């Protein structure tokens, strides 16, 4: 995408989302990141939406194939093919974050957003990991989420949607990856309760955003308890 203008890549990412062409969307946003400039709030969301949808489809396919495999070499070979593709996309996202989105992100909102992404893509790698580096992958996810949590608690109100989504995802990490269901439940409960107590400060539109994510926390708590 080196020959396309940054603004054109952003415009085409928005069109790709409208057309539900998420692989294209991700390629346009990778090109935009590689222009070397920082991303605005809206642009960060385009980047996340694109890759979350691409990897989300790969994860769903990997889960279908892994179930069939658990129940000739073809099933294993094809699960491995999908797994390698998934790992490649995660590595690409992590590479964008490391070169050089995180290091240039100084504001709490941007830095937390990117560290949350870093935790998420290591978590997706951990979902399929089985080898000698699996513990290190889990710890890489944990470390990214923890740094994001530390910044968010110092710099953002408890209703901030990025802070809430980070806590939501880190709680999923604890439950599904780290074998720490009590930590997952504790984090979700404390996050929900501290957000509830801060809703009185919010406008109608901010209230809607914060309560939407609070409901996602509650949905998980209902499933886990």
């Amino acid at each position: 995408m080196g020959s396309m203008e940054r603004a054109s890549l952003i415009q085409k990412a928005k069109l790709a989302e409208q057309a539900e062409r998420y692989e294209d969307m991700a390629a346009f946003m990778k090109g935009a990141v590689e222009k070397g400039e920082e991303l605005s709030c809206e642009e960060r969301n385009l980047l996340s939406v694109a890759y979350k949808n691409v990897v989300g489809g790969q994860r769903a396919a990997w889960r279908v194939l892994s179930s069939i495999e658990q129940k000739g070499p073809e099933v294993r070979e094809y699960r491995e093919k999908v797994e390698t593709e998934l790992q490649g996309v995660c590595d690409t996202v992590l590479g964008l974050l490391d070169s050089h989105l995180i290091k240039e992100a100084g504001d709490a909102e941007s830095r937390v957003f990117y560290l949350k992404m870093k935790g998420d893509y290591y978590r997706y790698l951990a979902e399929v990991a089985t080898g000698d580096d699996k513990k290190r992958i889990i710890d890489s996810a944990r470390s990214a989420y923890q740094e994001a949590m530390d910044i968010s608690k110092k710099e953002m109100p408890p209703t901030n949607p990025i802070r809430l989504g980070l806590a939501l995802n880190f709680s999923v990490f604890h439950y599904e990856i780290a074998n720490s269901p009590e930590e997952a439940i504790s984090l979700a409960k404390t996050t929900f309760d501290e957000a509830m107590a801060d809703l009185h400060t919010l406008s109608e539109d901010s209230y809607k955003d914060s309560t939407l994510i609070m409901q996602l926390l509650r949905d998980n708590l209902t499933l886990w308890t």
């Binding site: 939406v49 979350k52 949808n53 998420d120 939501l168 439950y175 994510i213 996602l216 949905d219």
Partner: peptide, 9 residues
């Protein structure tokens, strides 16, 4: 369990 969606929808 659910993680954060890409968009509010």
């Amino acid at each position: 369990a659910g993680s954060i969606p890409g968009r509010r929808s």
